Design a protein around this ligand. Structure first.
Ligand SMILES: Nc1ncnc2c1ncn2[C@@H]1O[C@H](COP(=O)(O)OP(=O)(O)O)[C@@H](O)[C@H]1O
Ligand SMILES: Nc1ncnc2c1ncn2[C@@H]1O[C@H](COP(=O)(O)OP(=O)(O)O)[C@@H](O)[C@H]1O
Ligand SMILES: Nc1ncnc2c1ncn2[C@@H]1O[C@H](COP(=O)(O)OP(=O)(O)O)[C@@H](O)[C@H]1O
Ligand SMILES: Nc1ncnc2c1ncn2[C@@H]1O[C@H](COP(=O)(O)OP(=O)(O)O)[C@@H](O)[C@H]1O
Ligand SMILES: Nc1ncnc2c1ncn2[C@@H]1O[C@H](COP(=O)(O)OP(=O)(O)O)[C@@H](O)[C@H]1O
Lengths: 257, 316, 134, 262, 255, 123, 114
């Protein structure tokens, strides 16, 4: 009939998190496969995030919005569909503030929007120009851009006077999912490398020291040409934050024709 | 095919019942191996709490529900009476010996063939232990390395009406320290009586396993399947030390196995680093009777449990 | 799943013969009281409710049309005796079921059926020879 | 709830596990086919009250009419029935020879598989004994009444005793399969079959060939088939022993019945 | 945490399902390997009967209940069209590769590390064929027994943990000489240990004698296979055993 | 209550055969061990044929006769007792000629007593 | 060896045993083979392969030797391996097995009463 209150926001989180947990391992060159059982017994072992969710029929409205946004992302941009859903799900998976602490969504949305403006400001600093004769601006992939941006917010949050500092830092740690999944697929220790990875961005330059998706160990992005475009990451973080801000603003799912 | 008021397991499933019990008892005690291993509690029911890592106490004082597993507990009692150490490692090797044997028994191999391989692997493993043992003179600098290696496995890496460091405040803490001292004294006793000592941290198990694999059959062609099972069983000790320390089980064992040179080289598991580590250099030394009795105790029980064909009720 | 019969009902051995011996006695009981001139009558009703009263053994068997396999053997044998002679169907029906009843306990004791056939074929010819002589 | 059925992954067909002896089950389907016709064997064969598909009653003892009316659905039995249909080609008799003999080969094969002998080694023995039987049959028209079945069994049993290896087990059982035919004639005549085999082997031990079972209810002794005029055809026994062995070997070579779909 | 009309195995049970299917399909086709192997019947339902040991007919024409096993059935259709042989042994190696991989995956090893060991052993395995289409190679599992000893005497060059995947590839190739001993009625362990123990100071081949069970030099008896069959076998088994191990989750697309 | 008919001989065979199947593997120098679950949850891993049957409870009187005859063997000869029960169980395990062939036991017993005089002479 | 040696004597002697008693008379001979059947099963060697060759040795070679080695599993002569057992133990072992089997076969009604 109708669902309102914290039950709505807690349900949209479990929906978007469930859709993200499916395609966590389909990221990077070591994209793990997924076995989709058709009703007639047919099976396809594809590993494309778009085709997986395209064929999976879902009932929750929040999960449909998370899927339809990635579809729209696929047309405007031919890459970053899997990262939008993982980040949007990880940004929503931090329910410590919504229920245990009883923070209103308007407080978190003020923090998510503040982080988005700062996340964009941090990418353009670590950018690098392009000699296209041989937007011309790339960024260091392999988790370097995520861990680099997370270091800026963690330092920027120290001067963030208010209760919004707690969800502001949580968005930073949520960006660590990208090197987390890349390390998990390689089979290496996730905590050991991610711990040493965060330390490199603190002392050494943030424009490098990412993750090797083929080897599993740490490596600089200047030595390995995994440089991604800038517009793909901006629309990826902008779409993930705007999608997380969307579902948090949903507090009453009601019927009506 | 049975009388009333009784039961009988005719087929080979009776052997699987004993293999499952040892596998379960293996997973219980593997978490309390070494200093970084966890502790187990002994609730007497009356209201007395007791924490300890000594495998002899976790098998003698702790009553075991499974009938088959209580047999291995009696051996840990016998193991503690001779050397006073190695009861935990004894059960882990028994659990892995029977585990590796099931892989070949499922392929139609008889148990008696595997046990004959253990007897061959034991003699080869027993001869290699004579070469690795260090017969140096026992000095205060050496016994401290033995006492530290024995006491670290029973305390919090720090050691009525006085604090625990006044050598305690509680009753069970005094009993825990009493057991560690008796295990520490017996460890220094064995090193002094038996002047030979052997490296620890699984360096002997890794070296003996490499020797067994580099050993062609000499008693029977199919006996080498048991020798291979005996080799893989010895590697459970460094595997468990990597688990309790929180490191990868496979990365640790592969690194120490890759260490090869044209000289005597025995590496072990560094619990703080995870990398290889010469146990003789850093000051980790085990007794010669402990590793010697393990091969004699592990083979005999793993053999006898494999020779069990049927499980009958004697009026149960 | 994969069975041999799959609806094919079949039984063999001594239980099948004993089942046919008992089924043949049912046909005897239907015409046991009609033996002789003063025999008891039998009332038979068709599907339309029309009644039929008659003490003739041949007329009774025609109206029954029993579906049992062993019973059809006696009925077709008795019917042939009616067409050829028109009398003696009850004597043939009673003697057949009585030959089967007397050898019933011997069949249960493990006596082979073929040994029983040699006795009837032998005792019959001796009886037919005794009739013509006397 | 686990553990469910083992070795069941093809359309949920009844796949007998290693303990359930899938080979032992296809043999039981063939043994039941013999019992339906083992009693109709010989001059004293028992008739069958067959009920036609038109609900018609027929009492007969012919093997071809029994199987034509008995809808044999088990494929393992269809192979032996196909041998009976192949028996009708090149000869018009010996149908129950295929059913009784093949049923004894498979029934006796279980005694070998239960010991542990491989099915591939059992087949090599029957193929060797079938080739050996074709060499002995000219030395024997041939006598009937189970006379050839004991002599051919006696000659094949001696070949297996002196032949070392594992093939002797299946070669000896190939000889005992021939004994099922005199046992069928004796059982259908009301005689202890073991006494017929004991006497038929004694007279053959003394060299009195051409001696068969004396068909009589009150006389379990034996007589000469030549003097009585009882004689069988050579090609009837040749093609029957050949097709029966191929049907038995073809069933032994099969170890699992699997469904399909076009 | 799930939607209605949806199911997914997030843990490693997806591998235990796919690994169990390959083991089941392994036990089915292993009985029809070689001449001593038994035959399989193909009942079309309408009454037709067809006997055949060819693995492609037992996978193309027959119907399989498990969805995962139907994937491997399509592989045999590809293996048949390129070489024309090796469809049965292709399924045995996949089952034994996945069997040995499950032994190490239970110890906490990632699947992707095992696939890197197969790619290294496969490249070394192909080079061994060139040392031992006008070219032919021996049979009777002589190449598998030889390649197994060759891969054991070969260390990685990318990482150390790939040593485990090479060991799984070595013990997986031995299923062929193991199965040939089973179908011939000989002990699985005695036959393999004899041919594997046979060594000399020269290039020597050795295989399973199906009639005697003792070792046998395939060249001295006239037992030869094709080069493209063994070449496509290593490339086919490695690709499918790899892809089956990379399956992290099984999701129902509205089944 | 009681037993009568063919069920007795086939039942005595399964009882004697079952007692022999227990100690089939307890023969020779490479004898196999046996696990005896005590009522208190304990285990005895003995491999002695006399000790195993001594501790096992038997309901059939035929098993008591097989066990009691083995004890008489131990008093006279402390060796070969395990061979008695195995042979007695194998000689009885051939139930084909016993019941399926409908031979009388007197026919079987006359053959077993004839072979015994021949087995003694050959040894 | 004594079991297989005795079994060959009965099987060769049963050829002249005219009657139905030859079948159980030969079955006793096959029952003696169980003794090496268990010795071979414990060692792990193939039972059918060795027991088949074991019976062939008694046919051709002398029956006083060529038994079974329980430790190794292969065949060996008892003149080369001192596994010689007494006669009184085997005769009493053979009589007690037949006398016991004859006893239980003579039972046809398990009756209760005192
Ligand atoms: N060669 C590589 N090494 C390491 N990481 C890579 C490599 N190629 C791509 N990636 C990572 O995979 C992620 C997804 O890349 P891509 O497939 O282009 O987008 P999408 O997965 O959305 O289609 C990127 O964030 C990038 O960091
Ligand atoms: N400091 C250490 N570093 C590495 N390994 C150790 C250290 N101390 C003990 N071990 C290992 O732990 C194992 C068990 O030691 P201990 O606790 O004395 O015996 P138990 O576990 O049987 O009581 C030994 O085999 C030894 O190799
Ligand atoms: N009068 C007889 N006496 C003894 N044996 C006979 C007699 N008639 C037939 N037989 C035996 O019965 C067997 C089957 O004969 P027949 O009925 O002609 O073939 P089928 O049973 O295949 O139809 C033959 O092998 C023959 O030896
Ligand atoms: N006569 C033989 N002796 C030994 N091995 C054989 C013999 N015939 C076939 N094989 C082995 O059986 C395997 C499978 O052969 P084949 O049946 O042709 O392919 P598939 O089993 O894929 O249909 C081959 O690898 C070959 O080595
Ligand atoms: N070393 C051996 N090799 C072969 N057979 C043996 C050996 N030792 C004993 N046996 C056999 O085991 C059987 C039982 O011997 P033993 O244990 O002395 O008697 P029991 O089993 O009655 O106690 C004997 O019949 C003997 O033939």
């Amino acid at each position: 009939k109708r669902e309102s209150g914290r039950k709505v926001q807690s349900g949209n989180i479990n929906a978007a998190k469930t859709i993200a947990d499916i395609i966590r391992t389909c990221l990077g060159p070591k994209s793990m496969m997924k076995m989709l059982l058709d009703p007639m017994g047919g099976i396809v072992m594809t590993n494309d995030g778009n085709a997986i969710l395209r064929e999976i029929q879902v009932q929750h409205p929040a999960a449909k919005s998370m899927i339809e946004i990635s579809r729209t992302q696929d047309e405007e941009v031919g890459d970053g569909t899997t990262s939008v859903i993982i980040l949007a799900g990880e940004m929503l998976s931090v329910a410590e503030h919504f229920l245990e602490q009883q923070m209103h969504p308007t407080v978190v949305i003020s923090a998510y929007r503040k982080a988005l403006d700062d996340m964009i400001s941090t990418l353009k600093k670590i950018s690098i120009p392009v000699d296209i004769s041989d937007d011309p601006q790339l960024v260091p992939g392999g988790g370097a851009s995520e861990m680099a941006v997370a270091h800026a917010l963690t330092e920027k949050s120290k001067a963030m006077t208010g209760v919004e500092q707690w969800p502001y830092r949580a968005v930073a740690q949520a960006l660590e999912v990208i090197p987390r999944t890349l390390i998990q697929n390689c089979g290496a220790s996730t905590i050991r490398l991610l711990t040493s990875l965060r330390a490199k961005h603190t002392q050494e330059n943030c424009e490098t020291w990412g993750v090797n998706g083929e080897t599993g160990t740490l490596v600089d992005m200047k030595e390995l040409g995994i440089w991604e475009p800038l517009a793909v990451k901006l629309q990826t973080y902008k779409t993930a934050v705007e999608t997380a801000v969307l579902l948090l603003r949903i507090d009453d799912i009601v019927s009506g024709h | 095919t049975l009388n009333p008021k009784a039961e009988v397991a005719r087929a080979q499933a009776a052997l699987a019942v004993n293999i499952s019990a040892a596998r379960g008892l293996q997973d219980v005690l593997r978490t309390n191996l070494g200093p970084k291993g966890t502790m187990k509690m002994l609730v007497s029911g009356a209201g007395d709490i007791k924490l300890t890592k000594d495998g002899n106490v976790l098998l003698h004082e702790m009553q075991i529900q499974h009938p088959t597993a209580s047999l291995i507990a009696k051996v840990a009692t016998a193991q503690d009476d001779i050397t006073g150490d190695g009861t935990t490692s004894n059960v882990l090797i028994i659990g892995e010996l029977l585990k590796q044997a099931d892989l070949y028994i499922s392929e139609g191999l008889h148990p008696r063939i595997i046990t004959e391989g253990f007897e061959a692997a034991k003699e080869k493993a027993l001869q290699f232990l004579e070469e690795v043992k260090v017969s140096r003179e026992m000095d205060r600098e050496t016994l401290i390395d033995v006492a530290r290696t024995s006491l670290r496995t029973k305390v919090h890496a720090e050691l009525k009406h006085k604090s625990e460091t006044d050598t305690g405040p509680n009753k069970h803490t005094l009993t825990q320290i009493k057991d560690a001292v008796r295990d520490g004294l017996r460890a220094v006793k064995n090193a002094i009586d038996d002047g030979c000592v052997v490296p620890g941290a699984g360096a002997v198990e890794v070296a003996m396993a490499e020797a067994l694999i580099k050993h062609k059959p000499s008693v029977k062609g199919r006996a080498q399947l048991g020798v291979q099972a005996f080799a893989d069983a010895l590697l459970i000790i460094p595997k468990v030390l990597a688990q309790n320390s929180g490191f990868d089980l496979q990365e640790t064992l592969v690194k120490i196995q890759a260490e090869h040179s044209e000289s005597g080289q025995l590496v072990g598991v560094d619990l703080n680093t995870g990398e290889p580590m010469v146990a003789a250099e850093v000051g980790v030394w085990d007794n010669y009777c402990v590793k010697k009795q393990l091969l004699h105790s592990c083979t005999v029980i793993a053999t006898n449990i494999l020779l069990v064909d049927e499980i009958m009720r004697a009026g149960m | 799943v994969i069975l041999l019969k799959e609806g094919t009902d079949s039984s063999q051995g001594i239980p099948q013969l004993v089942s046919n011996i008992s089924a043949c006695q049912v046909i005897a009981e239907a015409v046991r009281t009609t033996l002789g001139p003063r025999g008891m009558d039998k009332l038979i009703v068709d599907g339309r409710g029309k009644a039929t009263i008659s003490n003739d053994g041949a007329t009774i068997l025609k109206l029954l049309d029993v579906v049992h396999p062993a019973a059809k053997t006696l009925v077709d044998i008795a019917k042939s005796q009616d067409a050829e002679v028109g009398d003696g169907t009850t004597s043939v029906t009673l003697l057949a079921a009585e030959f089967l009843k007397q050898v019933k306990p011997y069949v249960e004791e493990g006596l082979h059926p073929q040994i029983i056939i040699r006795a009837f074929r032998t005792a019959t010819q001796l009886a037919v020879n005794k009739i013509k002589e006397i | 709830k686990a553990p469910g059925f083992a070795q069941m992954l093809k359309e949920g067909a009844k796949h007998f596990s290693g303990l359930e002896e899938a080979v032992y089950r296809n043999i039981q389907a063939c043994k039941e086919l013999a019992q339906t016709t083992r009693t109709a064997y010989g001059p004293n064969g028992m008739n069958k009250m067959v009920i036609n598909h038109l609900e018609k009653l027929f009492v007969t003892n012919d093997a071809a009419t029994i199987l034509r009316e008995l809808e044999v659905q088990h494929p393992a039995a269809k192979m032996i029935v196909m041998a009976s249909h192949m028996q009708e080609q090149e000869v018009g008799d010996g149908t129950n020879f295929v059913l009784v003999f093949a049923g004894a080969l498979l029934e006796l094969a279980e005694e070998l598989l239960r010991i542990g002998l491989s099915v591939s080694e059992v087949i090599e023995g029957y193929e060797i004994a079938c080739r050996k039987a074709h060499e002995i049959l000219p030395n024997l028209l041939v006598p009937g009444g189970g006379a050839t079945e004991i002599e051919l069994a006696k000659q094949i049993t001696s070949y297996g005793e002196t032949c070392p290896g594992l093939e002797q087990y299946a070669i000896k059982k190939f000889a005992e399969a021939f004994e099922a035919i005199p046992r069928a004639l004796a059982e259908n005549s009301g005689v202890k079959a073991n006494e017929v085999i004991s006497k038929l082997y004694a007279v053959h031990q003394e060299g009195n060939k051409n001696v068969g079972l004396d068909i009589e209810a009150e006389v379990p002794a034996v007589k000469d088939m030549l003097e009585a005029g009882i004689l069988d055809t050579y090609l009837g026994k040749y093609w029957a022993i050949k097709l029966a062995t191929n049907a038995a070997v073809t069933v032994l070579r099969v170890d699992q019945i699997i469904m399909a779909k076009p």
